[PDB]
């Protein structure tokens, strides 16, 4: 990755430089210099001595300050300093006031702005993930939770006595669709995060599952098995009208949207072993799009439509892999066991998924260039179905 | 218990 210097911020209620460093490394785009190896610890743009950094192959340095305010809040400021072609030039800088609970958010804001200034890619460090935890609690063992993308600041959205599956975020980040077995069978519901209001979407006979909101906010795709097998359906969210997208006796599920809100990728057993297909929601037959491997399933298409990640079987093993949608090129990304249910960061730089790490008590992160892999912090249960929020 | 009955998807007996 791109070498970069991230210096401890001048003060401590939280280690802001540590957060920036972790964020930049998580993206796979950067290789922040290990803290022990730093040549100096400048607290301001003026204290930067650019030669010590260029000597290490580093052409950008992040410095910052954290100052406490009389009202009990904190000022967090950062400055991005060029240590390459224009040594000492401030490329980017910002300063803001936050109370203690938002110090992590302050760090992620610095990460986002530094990231974007250097890569030209919008940052996703202030985003969230939704997931389901099966705890050992007896009365309500299933919880739909939300946390920051790195596992911090987790909160409970819904608790249930019965299994929950496959949460999906609305594009404005304000709602979560999910599958619940609370009534004694499957139902698809949409829950408004702010007030806890639950809208009933579908509870047809047999299975109701695998929801996905269109990027434009107008439609919800999902699968129903009422006809005798899983088929894809789309609901117009304004009216509640439902249209059948696929028909026939194969199983078609796990829909994910293309950026145009008109096409879906999805998994079908039409060819035998699961493969990924594309279909226009308005008409026409599905087209198979995965030809490499022996099995490919549970796709997520990137927000720019350039590629998709999915669970792919190659050389006998299943891992998270990425398929370029223009070239057809495929790259295996993860190396862990029992890799499943991948979900892309809204900038396409990172994938969150589930594996055997910690016997399923943790979620995993892998950068989409395959350069960096990490476990999220452990939860107090079995964690499944991660869903990466849109930009917030 | 809870399953989509596909025999293969992420919602096939996940729990
Ligand atoms: Ca999926
Ligand atoms: Ca997507």
Short mmCIF file of C-alpha atoms and ligand atoms in Angstrom, two decimals:
data_model
loop_
_atom_site.label_atom_id
_atom_site.label_comp_id
_atom_site.label_asym_id
_atom_site.label_seq_id
_atom_site.Cartn_x
_atom_site.Cartn_y
_atom_site.Cartn_z
CA UNK A 1 0.00 0.00 0.00
CA UNK A 2 0.86 3.70 -0.11
CA UNK A 3 3.30 4.54 2.74
CA UNK A 4 2.02 7.34 5.05
CA UNK A 5 3.00 8.97 8.35
CA UNK A 6 0.30 9.23 11.02
CA UNK A 7 1.60 11.02 14.15
CA UNK A 8 -0.07 10.88 17.60
CA UNK A 9 -2.23 13.98 17.93
CA UNK A 10 -0.99 16.69 20.32
CA UNK A 11 -2.93 16.33 23.61
CA UNK A 12 -5.99 11.77 26.36
CA UNK A 13 -9.69 10.73 26.07
CA UNK A 14 -8.99 8.77 22.82
CA UNK A 15 -6.03 8.04 20.52
CA UNK A 16 -7.12 9.93 17.34
CA UNK A 17 -3.92 9.26 15.34
CA UNK A 18 -4.39 5.55 16.22
CA UNK A 19 -7.91 5.64 14.71
CA UNK A 20 -6.74 7.44 11.54
CA UNK A 21 -3.92 4.92 11.19
CA UNK A 22 -6.32 1.96 11.67
CA UNK A 23 -8.83 3.40 9.18
CA UNK A 24 -6.24 4.06 6.44
CA UNK A 25 -4.78 0.56 6.90
CA UNK A 26 -8.25 -1.12 6.86
CA UNK A 27 -8.87 0.35 3.37
CA UNK A 28 -5.93 -1.55 1.94
CA UNK A 29 -4.85 1.69 0.25
CA UNK A 30 -2.26 2.73 2.81
CA UNK A 31 0.60 1.42 4.87
CA UNK A 32 0.86 3.72 7.89
CA UNK A 33 4.33 3.70 9.42
CA UNK A 34 4.40 1.69 12.65
CA UNK A 35 4.36 4.09 15.64
CA UNK A 36 7.68 2.77 17.04
CA UNK A 37 9.46 3.71 13.79
CA UNK A 38 8.41 7.39 13.63
CA UNK A 39 11.37 9.76 12.99
CA UNK A 40 9.72 12.64 14.88
CA UNK A 41 6.39 13.55 16.52
CA UNK A 42 5.44 17.00 15.16
CA UNK A 43 2.35 18.51 16.78
CA UNK A 44 1.81 21.05 14.03
CA UNK A 45 2.36 21.50 10.28
CA UNK A 46 5.31 23.80 11.10
CA UNK A 47 7.11 21.06 13.11
CA UNK A 48 7.09 18.65 10.17
CA UNK A 49 10.61 17.99 8.78
CA UNK A 50 9.88 16.56 5.44
CA UNK A 51 13.29 15.00 4.71
CA UNK A 52 12.96 12.55 7.63
CA UNK A 53 9.73 11.29 6.01
CA UNK A 54 10.76 11.26 2.32
CA UNK A 55 13.81 9.27 3.52
CA UNK A 56 11.33 6.54 4.46
CA UNK A 57 9.43 6.64 1.17
CA UNK A 58 6.69 8.77 2.76
CA UNK A 59 5.28 11.81 0.94
CA UNK A 60 2.34 12.74 3.18
CA UNK A 61 2.17 13.17 6.98
CA UNK A 62 -0.93 13.50 9.18
CA UNK A 63 -0.53 15.63 12.29
CA UNK A 64 -3.20 16.97 14.61
CA UNK A 65 -4.25 18.45 17.93
CA UNK A 66 -6.86 17.55 20.57
CA UNK A 67 -7.68 20.38 23.01
CA UNK A 68 -10.30 20.32 25.82
CA UNK A 69 -12.94 23.09 25.97
CA UNK A 70 -14.45 24.84 29.07
CA UNK A 71 -17.91 23.37 28.25
CA UNK A 72 -16.37 19.89 28.54
CA UNK A 73 -16.18 19.29 24.75
CA UNK A 74 -12.95 18.90 22.66
CA UNK A 75 -11.42 20.56 19.66
CA UNK A 76 -10.04 18.01 17.19
CA UNK A 77 -7.97 19.35 14.31
CA UNK A 78 -5.75 17.67 11.72
CA UNK A 79 -3.46 18.93 9.01
CA UNK A 80 -2.28 16.82 6.06
CA UNK A 81 1.25 17.87 5.16
CA UNK A 82 3.07 17.14 1.90
CA UNK A 83 6.53 15.60 2.50
CA UNK A 84 7.27 14.86 -1.16
CA UNK A 85 7.24 17.19 -4.17
CA UNK A 86 5.96 20.25 -2.28
CA UNK A 87 7.45 19.72 1.19
CA UNK A 88 5.63 21.45 4.06
CA UNK A 89 2.52 22.36 2.01
CA UNK A 90 -0.78 21.78 3.84
CA UNK A 91 -2.82 19.65 1.45
CA UNK A 92 -5.88 19.44 3.70
CA UNK A 93 -6.93 20.55 7.19
CA UNK A 94 -10.04 20.81 9.35
CA UNK A 95 -11.03 21.56 12.93
CA UNK A 96 -14.23 20.78 14.77
CA UNK A 97 -15.75 20.58 18.27
CA UNK A 98 -17.07 17.26 19.60
CA UNK A 99 -18.08 15.90 22.99
CA UNK A 100 -16.38 12.73 24.30
CA UNK A 101 -18.88 10.20 22.79
CA UNK A 102 -18.05 11.56 19.31
CA UNK A 103 -14.24 11.45 19.53
CA UNK A 104 -14.13 8.24 17.47
CA UNK A 105 -16.40 9.99 14.92
CA UNK A 106 -13.90 12.91 14.94
CA UNK A 107 -11.07 10.49 14.08
CA UNK A 108 -13.07 8.85 11.28
CA UNK A 109 -13.84 12.33 9.84
CA UNK A 110 -10.06 13.06 9.67
CA UNK A 111 -9.50 9.59 8.10
CA UNK A 112 -12.25 10.24 5.52
CA UNK A 113 -10.87 13.64 4.44
CA UNK A 114 -7.23 12.47 4.36
CA UNK A 115 -8.27 9.35 2.43
CA UNK A 116 -10.26 11.30 -0.18
CA UNK A 117 -7.59 14.03 -0.63
CA UNK A 118 -4.92 11.45 -1.38
CA UNK A 119 -6.84 8.76 -3.32
CA UNK A 120 -9.68 10.65 -5.02
CA UNK A 121 -12.03 8.02 -3.46
CA UNK A 122 -14.71 9.17 -0.98
CA UNK A 123 -14.03 7.79 2.55
CA UNK A 124 -16.28 5.21 4.19
CA UNK A 125 -14.89 5.45 7.73
CA UNK A 126 -18.03 7.07 9.19
CA UNK A 127 -20.32 4.30 7.98
CA UNK A 128 -22.04 1.54 9.89
CA UNK A 129 -22.73 -2.14 9.69
CA UNK A 130 -25.82 -4.08 10.64
CA UNK A 131 -25.66 -7.74 11.70
CA UNK A 132 -27.53 -10.41 13.62
CA UNK A 133 -26.15 -11.84 16.89
CA UNK A 134 -27.47 -15.08 18.37
CA UNK A 135 -26.57 -14.77 22.07
CA UNK A 136 -26.90 -17.22 24.90
CA UNK A 137 -29.69 -15.11 26.40
CA UNK A 138 -32.70 -17.35 26.83
CA UNK A 139 -35.77 -15.18 26.30
CA UNK A 140 -34.60 -13.03 23.34
CA UNK A 141 -31.55 -14.81 21.94
CA UNK A 142 -31.59 -13.04 18.53
CA UNK A 143 -30.59 -9.39 18.18
CA UNK A 144 -30.37 -7.16 15.12
CA UNK A 145 -27.52 -4.79 15.99
CA UNK A 146 -25.77 -1.84 14.36
CA UNK A 147 -22.20 -0.59 15.04
CA UNK A 148 -19.52 1.63 13.47
CA UNK A 149 -17.86 -0.21 10.55
CA UNK A 150 -14.91 -1.18 12.84
CA UNK A 151 -17.12 -2.72 15.55
CA UNK A 152 -17.32 0.17 18.03
CA UNK A 153 -20.45 1.95 19.35
CA UNK A 154 -22.77 -1.03 18.94
CA UNK A 155 -26.48 -0.67 19.72
CA UNK A 156 -29.47 -2.98 19.60
CA UNK A 157 -32.14 -2.35 17.00
CA UNK A 158 -34.44 -5.31 17.69
CA UNK A 159 -34.51 -8.32 20.00
CA UNK A 160 -36.36 -11.47 19.17
CA UNK A 161 -37.22 -14.91 20.57
CA UNK A 162 -37.03 -16.30 17.08
CA UNK A 163 -34.35 -16.27 14.35
CA UNK A 164 -33.69 -13.10 12.35
CA UNK A 165 -31.92 -13.02 8.97
CA UNK A 166 -30.46 -10.89 6.22
CA UNK A 167 -30.73 -7.27 7.23
CA UNK A 168 -30.54 -4.68 4.42
CA UNK A 169 -30.12 -0.87 4.72
CA UNK A 170 -32.31 1.69 2.96
CA UNK A 171 -30.10 4.00 0.76
CA UNK A 172 -30.68 6.97 3.12
CA UNK A 173 -29.50 4.80 6.04
CA UNK A 174 -32.66 5.38 8.06
CA UNK A 175 -34.31 1.93 7.80
CA UNK A 176 -33.41 -1.76 7.93
CA UNK A 177 -35.38 -4.48 6.17
CA UNK A 178 -34.96 -7.95 7.67
CA UNK A 179 -36.40 -11.42 7.92
CA UNK A 180 -38.08 -12.40 11.17
CA UNK A 181 -39.57 -15.72 12.34
CA UNK A 182 -41.27 -14.05 15.35
CA UNK A 183 -44.81 -14.87 14.15
CA UNK A 184 -43.82 -18.58 13.94
CA UNK A 185 -42.87 -18.35 10.23
CA UNK A 186 -40.91 -16.02 7.93
CA UNK A 187 -41.93 -12.41 7.44
CA UNK A 188 -40.11 -9.53 5.76
CA UNK A 189 -40.35 -6.26 7.71
CA UNK A 190 -38.85 -2.76 7.45
CA UNK A 191 -37.87 -1.06 10.68
CA UNK A 192 -37.36 2.70 11.05
CA UNK A 193 -34.28 3.16 13.25
CA UNK A 194 -35.19 6.53 14.80
CA UNK A 195 -38.49 5.45 16.38
CA UNK A 196 -38.54 1.64 16.19
CA UNK A 197 -41.62 1.58 13.92
CA UNK A 198 -42.03 -1.73 12.01
CA UNK A 199 -43.71 -1.90 8.59
CA UNK A 200 -44.92 -5.36 7.50
CA UNK A 201 -43.68 -5.96 3.93
CA UNK A 202 -44.58 -9.56 3.08
CA UNK A 203 -45.60 -12.69 4.87
CA UNK A 204 -46.76 -14.99 2.05
CA UNK A 205 -47.01 -18.73 2.58
CA UNK A 206 -43.59 -20.47 2.67
CA UNK A 207 -40.36 -18.39 2.61
CA UNK A 208 -40.12 -14.59 2.53
CA UNK A 209 -36.47 -13.50 2.53
CA UNK A 210 -33.22 -11.92 1.33
CA UNK A 211 -34.29 -8.25 1.01
CA UNK A 212 -32.30 -5.51 -0.82
CA UNK A 213 -33.33 -1.84 -1.34
CA UNK A 214 -32.69 -0.20 -4.71
CA UNK A 215 -30.01 2.53 -4.72
CA UNK A 216 -32.70 5.05 -5.80
CA UNK A 217 -34.90 4.28 -2.78
CA UNK A 218 -38.01 3.38 -4.72
CA UNK A 219 -37.92 -0.43 -4.65
CA UNK A 220 -37.33 -3.44 -2.48
CA UNK A 221 -36.19 -6.73 -4.06
CA UNK A 222 -36.63 -10.02 -2.15
CA UNK A 223 -37.28 -13.70 -2.62
CA UNK A 224 -40.48 -15.68 -2.01
CA UNK A 225 -40.92 -19.44 -2.27
CA UNK A 226 -44.75 -19.38 -2.39
CA UNK A 227 -44.82 -20.79 -5.96
CA UNK A 228 -42.96 -23.96 -4.92
CA UNK A 229 -39.45 -22.54 -5.20
CA UNK A 230 -37.60 -19.29 -4.50
CA UNK A 231 -38.23 -16.59 -7.06
CA UNK A 232 -37.36 -12.92 -7.10
CA UNK A 233 -39.93 -10.23 -6.56
CA UNK A 234 -39.80 -6.46 -6.38
CA UNK A 235 -42.05 -4.15 -4.38
CA UNK A 236 -42.68 -0.51 -5.28
CA UNK A 237 -42.14 1.04 -1.86
CA UNK A 238 -44.49 4.01 -2.42
CA UNK A 239 -47.51 1.83 -3.35
CA UNK A 240 -46.80 -1.60 -1.93
CA UNK A 241 -47.39 -3.21 -5.32
CA UNK A 242 -45.35 -6.39 -5.88
CA UNK A 243 -44.12 -7.71 -9.27
CA UNK A 244 -42.67 -11.13 -9.96
CA UNK A 245 -39.23 -10.84 -11.59
CA UNK A 246 -38.28 -14.52 -12.04
CA UNK A 247 -40.52 -17.54 -12.53
CA UNK A 248 -39.92 -21.25 -12.94
CA UNK A 249 -38.88 -24.21 -10.84
CA UNK A 250 -35.30 -23.34 -9.94
CA UNK A 251 -34.38 -21.48 -6.72
CA UNK A 252 -33.50 -17.80 -7.22
CA UNK A 253 -32.51 -15.72 -4.20
CA UNK A 254 -29.94 -13.31 -2.62
CA UNK A 255 -30.75 -10.36 -4.92
CA UNK A 256 -28.41 -7.38 -5.03
CA UNK A 257 -28.88 -4.19 -7.08
CA UNK A 258 -26.87 -2.71 -9.93
CA UNK A 259 -26.38 1.12 -9.63
CA UNK A 260 -29.19 1.84 -12.15
CA UNK A 261 -31.89 0.48 -9.84
CA UNK A 262 -33.14 -1.51 -12.88
CA UNK A 263 -30.98 -4.61 -12.83
CA UNK A 264 -30.33 -7.26 -10.16
CA UNK A 265 -27.58 -9.84 -9.72
CA UNK A 266 -28.73 -12.93 -7.80
CA UNK A 267 -28.00 -16.55 -7.08
CA UNK A 268 -29.70 -19.38 -8.96
CA UNK A 269 -29.36 -23.17 -8.98
CA UNK A 270 -30.76 -23.18 -12.57
CA UNK A 271 -27.42 -24.52 -13.91
CA UNK A 272 -26.91 -27.07 -11.08
CA UNK A 273 -24.44 -25.72 -8.54
CA UNK A 274 -25.26 -22.10 -7.56
CA UNK A 275 -24.04 -19.39 -9.96
CA UNK A 276 -24.61 -15.64 -10.17
CA UNK A 277 -27.08 -14.26 -12.75
CA UNK A 278 -28.21 -10.77 -13.84
CA UNK A 279 -31.78 -9.80 -14.70
CA UNK A 280 -33.54 -6.58 -15.69
CA UNK A 281 -36.54 -6.05 -13.36
CA UNK A 282 -38.81 -4.96 -16.22
CA UNK A 283 -38.53 -7.96 -18.53
CA UNK A 284 -36.36 -10.59 -20.11
CA UNK A 285 -34.63 -13.77 -19.11
CA UNK A 286 -31.82 -13.92 -16.57
CA UNK A 287 -28.26 -14.11 -17.90
CA UNK A 288 -25.54 -16.12 -16.17
CA UNK A 289 -22.54 -13.92 -15.32
CA UNK A 290 -20.13 -16.17 -13.36
CA UNK A 291 -18.23 -18.66 -15.47
CA UNK A 292 -15.10 -19.18 -13.40
CA UNK A 293 -14.90 -21.61 -10.47
CA UNK A 294 -17.39 -24.43 -9.87
CA UNK A 295 -19.77 -22.48 -7.67
CA UNK A 296 -20.50 -18.77 -7.12
CA UNK A 297 -23.11 -17.29 -4.84
CA UNK A 298 -24.41 -14.43 -2.61
CA UNK A 299 -23.17 -11.42 -4.56
CA UNK A 300 -22.85 -7.71 -3.70
CA UNK A 301 -22.33 -5.33 -6.68
CA UNK A 302 -20.15 -2.25 -5.93
CA UNK A 303 -21.84 1.15 -5.79
CA UNK A 304 -19.99 2.25 -8.96
CA UNK A 305 -20.95 -0.99 -10.79
CA UNK A 306 -17.29 -1.75 -11.60
CA UNK A 307 -17.18 -5.12 -9.79
CA UNK A 308 -18.97 -7.54 -7.50
CA UNK A 309 -17.83 -9.66 -4.57
CA UNK A 310 -19.37 -13.10 -3.89
CA UNK A 311 -18.63 -16.46 -2.30
CA UNK A 312 -16.72 -18.48 -4.90
CA UNK A 313 -15.39 -22.09 -5.05
CA UNK A 314 -11.97 -22.49 -6.75
CA UNK A 315 -9.41 -25.31 -6.25
CA UNK A 316 -11.92 -27.02 -3.91
CA UNK A 317 -12.32 -24.18 -1.39
CA UNK A 318 -14.90 -21.39 -1.00
CA UNK A 319 -13.67 -17.85 -0.31
CA UNK A 320 -14.74 -14.24 -0.84
CA UNK A 321 -13.70 -13.35 -4.36
CA UNK A 322 -14.17 -10.34 -6.62
CA UNK A 323 -15.28 -10.29 -10.26
CA UNK A 324 -14.62 -7.30 -12.49
CA UNK A 325 -17.89 -6.55 -14.29
CA UNK A 326 -16.20 -5.04 -17.38
CA UNK A 327 -13.27 -7.41 -17.92
CA UNK A 328 -14.63 -10.59 -16.34
CA UNK A 329 -11.39 -10.98 -14.34
CA UNK A 330 -11.73 -12.77 -10.96
CA UNK A 331 -9.53 -12.41 -7.82
CA UNK A 332 -9.86 -14.45 -4.60
CA UNK A 333 -9.71 -12.03 -1.69
CA UNK A 334 -10.04 -13.97 1.60
CA UNK A 335 -8.08 -16.92 3.01
CA UNK A 336 -10.18 -17.78 6.06
CA UNK A 337 -12.52 -20.75 6.58
CA UNK A 338 -16.29 -20.95 6.06
CA UNK A 339 -16.35 -17.56 4.33
CA UNK A 340 -19.88 -16.34 3.73
CA UNK A 341 -22.29 -13.43 3.28
CA UNK A 342 -19.94 -10.61 2.01
CA UNK A 343 -21.04 -6.95 1.96
CA UNK A 344 -19.21 -4.01 0.33
CA UNK A 345 -18.28 -0.67 1.83
CA UNK A 346 -20.09 2.11 -0.11
CA UNK A 347 -16.76 3.17 -1.72
CA UNK A 348 -15.98 -0.44 -2.77
CA UNK A 349 -12.62 -0.56 -0.92
CA UNK A 350 -13.50 -3.10 1.81
CA UNK A 351 -15.65 -6.17 2.30
CA UNK A 352 -17.17 -7.30 5.56
CA UNK A 353 -18.05 -10.95 5.89
CA UNK A 354 -18.53 -13.93 8.18
CA UNK A 355 -16.04 -16.82 8.79
CA UNK A 356 -14.71 -19.42 11.27
CA UNK A 357 -12.57 -16.75 12.97
CA UNK A 358 -13.37 -17.04 16.70
CA UNK A 359 -15.82 -19.86 15.89
CA UNK A 360 -18.14 -17.25 14.33
CA UNK A 361 -18.13 -14.78 17.26
CA UNK A 362 -16.43 -12.16 15.07
CA UNK A 363 -16.90 -10.60 11.66
CA UNK A 364 -14.03 -10.17 9.23
CA UNK A 365 -12.79 -7.37 7.03
CA UNK A 366 -10.80 -7.72 3.84
CA UNK A 367 -9.71 -4.90 1.49
CA UNK A 368 -10.91 -5.37 -2.08
CA UNK A 369 -7.34 -5.31 -3.40
CA UNK A 370 -6.75 -8.29 -1.05
CA UNK A 371 -3.93 -6.44 0.73
CA UNK A 372 -5.33 -6.28 4.27
CA UNK A 373 -7.37 -8.60 6.48
CA UNK A 374 -8.57 -8.22 10.09
CA UNK A 375 -11.04 -9.56 12.63
CA UNK A 376 -13.57 -7.12 14.05
CA UNK A 377 -13.82 -7.13 17.88
CA UNK A 378 -15.58 -10.17 19.34
CA UNK A 379 -19.27 -10.02 20.13
CA UNK A 380 -21.06 -11.89 22.95
CA UNK A 381 -22.56 -14.42 20.49
CA UNK A 382 -22.65 -15.98 17.00
CA UNK A 383 -22.56 -13.15 14.43
CA UNK A 384 -24.06 -13.49 10.95
CA UNK A 385 -25.46 -11.59 7.97
CA UNK A 386 -23.36 -8.39 8.00
CA UNK A 387 -24.73 -5.51 5.89
CA UNK A 388 -22.55 -2.48 5.23
CA UNK A 389 -24.47 0.83 5.38
CA UNK A 390 -24.60 3.38 2.58
CA UNK A 391 -22.64 6.63 3.00
CA UNK A 392 -24.24 8.40 5.94
CA UNK B 1 -35.18 -24.92 11.95
CA UNK B 2 -35.71 -21.59 10.15
CA UNK B 3 -34.74 -22.19 6.51
CA UNK B 4 -35.48 -21.10 2.95
CA UNK B 5 -35.34 -24.77 1.85
CA UNK B 6 -32.94 -24.04 -0.99
CA UNK B 7 -30.40 -26.53 0.34
CA UNK B 8 -27.57 -24.02 -0.40
CA UNK B 9 -28.25 -20.32 0.18
CA UNK B 10 -27.23 -18.10 3.06
CA UNK B 11 -30.80 -18.53 4.40
CA UNK B 12 -30.70 -22.34 4.28
CA UNK B 13 -30.72 -23.29 7.97
CA UNK B 14 -28.21 -20.52 8.94
CA UNK B 15 -28.74 -20.96 12.69
CA1 LIG C 1 -26.16 -11.01 0.16
CA1 LIG C 2 -24.18 -2.92 -3.72
#
